[PDB]
Design a binder for these strands. Structure first.
Length: 315
RNA sequence: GGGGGGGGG
């Protein structure tokens, strides 16, 4: 069953869901019984593929088949419903798991807190944070990161920083994601100097900046009118073997264009093409906006044609 | 062998 499970999971994660569903059928034919991991894996692949209804059929199928859902089953479904905007049903599954004696774990609480924060229901999220504490389910680096992000984005950056305090004090070591989240939140709140000090500090703590780190500061510097430093960090991260990705390029294209520096931006569009980093819908959209605003509408219309011709769907 | 957190228009 483990062979089929691993392949199924590999196929789903590569977007080859129909092959996955094929193998699921093969293993039943061949007398290799799906277990809870088989179903969990297919349910997670389907949800992530936009195919929540078929995922909900398989959940029904495993109960029909005597294969009891486990904490990972419920976590996977809760996260899928939450992301698809179905938070109320996710909250009802969380009630249902407790009623059935399937103990929620730190991932359960984390998933829910994230879904609640992103839905605007930060006070509820903070209640659950309280609740997991009273229930003896210890917050981990991910709980803290989730809350720090939710707070900052709700414009509650002071709490967010208190919480970074609490975290360090209870021996939860901030990781690259913590630093990345706080850097973005500070930058977006116009506290760019503190964000650049945190950049220095994570390097001192041996917590290596990653692409997300550089992307975040690059954007933060661009929008603050510090394009030269932003272009400096671009060169730097390359010199340090941290590969610019599509986001890095789009960010820099957009900052060059709003700064009046469109031929540089069109240069990078070329450059990323050369370097096999494929422009995505955000790339095209940024370029089209920049060209239009510079009075180069004929060229923006031509790019719109190009993105469609190349299968990058306009949104 | 399966589930949760950070960056761009």
């Amino acid at each position: 069953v483990v062979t089929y499970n691993t392949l199924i999971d590999g196929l789903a994660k590569a977007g080859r869901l129909e092959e996955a569903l094929q193998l699921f059928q093969e293993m039943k034919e061949k007398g290799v019984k799906p277990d809870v991991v088989t179903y969990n894996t297919l349910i997670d692949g389907l949800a992530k593929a936009g195919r929540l209804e078929e995922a909900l059929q398989l959940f029904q199928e495993m109960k029909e088949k005597g294969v009891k859902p486990d904490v990972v089953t419920y976590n996977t479904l809760i996260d899928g419903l939450a992301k698809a905007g179905r938070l109320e049903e996710a909250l009802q599954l969380f009630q249902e798991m407790k009623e059935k004696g399937v103990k929620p774990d730190v991932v359960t609480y984390n998933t829910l807190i994230d879904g609640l924060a992103k839905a605007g229901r930060l006070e509820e999220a903070l209640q659950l944070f309280q609740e997991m504490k009273e229930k003896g389910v210890k917050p981990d680096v991910v709980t803290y990161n989730t809350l720090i992000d939710g707070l900052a984005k709700a414009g509650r950056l002071e709490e967010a920083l208190q919480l970074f305090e609490e975290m360090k004090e209870k021996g939860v070591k901030p990781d690259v994601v913590t630093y990345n989240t706080l850097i973005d939140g500070l930058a977006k709140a116009g506290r760019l100097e503190e964000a650049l000090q945190l950049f220095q500090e994570m390097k001192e703590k041996g917590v290596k900046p990653d692409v997300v780190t550089y992307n975040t500061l690059i954007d933060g510097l661009a929008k603050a009118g510090r394009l030269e430093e932003a272009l400096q960090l671009f060169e730097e991260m390359k010199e340090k073997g941290v590969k610019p990705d599509v986001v890095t390029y789009n960010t820099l294209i957009d900052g060059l264009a709003k700064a009046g520096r469109l031929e540089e931006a069109l240069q990078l569009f070329e450059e990323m093409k050369e370097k096999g980093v494929k422009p995505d819908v955000v790339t095209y959209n940024t370029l089209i906006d920049g060209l239009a605003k510079a009075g180069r509408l004929e060229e923006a219309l031509q790019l719109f044609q190009e993105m469609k011709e190349k299968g990058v769907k306009p949104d």
